[PDB]
Amino acid sequence: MLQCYNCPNPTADCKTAVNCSSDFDACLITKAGLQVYNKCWKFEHCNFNDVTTRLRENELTYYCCKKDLCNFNEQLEN
């Protein structure tokens, strides 16, 4: 298992640590406008097409990693 911060809805400070299911091999943190997403994710989906479409967001920056709780917000700039 990989541990990630994971919140089902976007929020300013997601600190809910989850033990991701085995289908997830990465953590994701995305800043889309004023919203922030933190999710258990899949490396295969660490690209603009898969992030934008799944979150239904247009403009965004994303950061994927594979270390426990690595998807903290400060991984991305303002």
All structural domains of the chain with their residue ranges: 1-78
Of 78, 76, 74, nearest to 15 (Cα)? Answer: 74
The runs of H, that is alpha helices, within 1-78 are: 48-55
Cβ proximity of 8 and 46 under 8 Å? no
Resolution in A: 1.8
Intra-chain end-to-end CA distance of the chain, in Å? 30
Residue position matching structure tokens 């994701």: 28
> With respect to CATH, is domain 1-78 assigned 2.10.60.10?
yes
Phi, psi of 75, deg, nearest 5: -70, -20
Provide the experimental method for this PDB entry.
X-ray
Of 37, 27, 39, 33, nearest to 64 (Cα)? Answer: 27
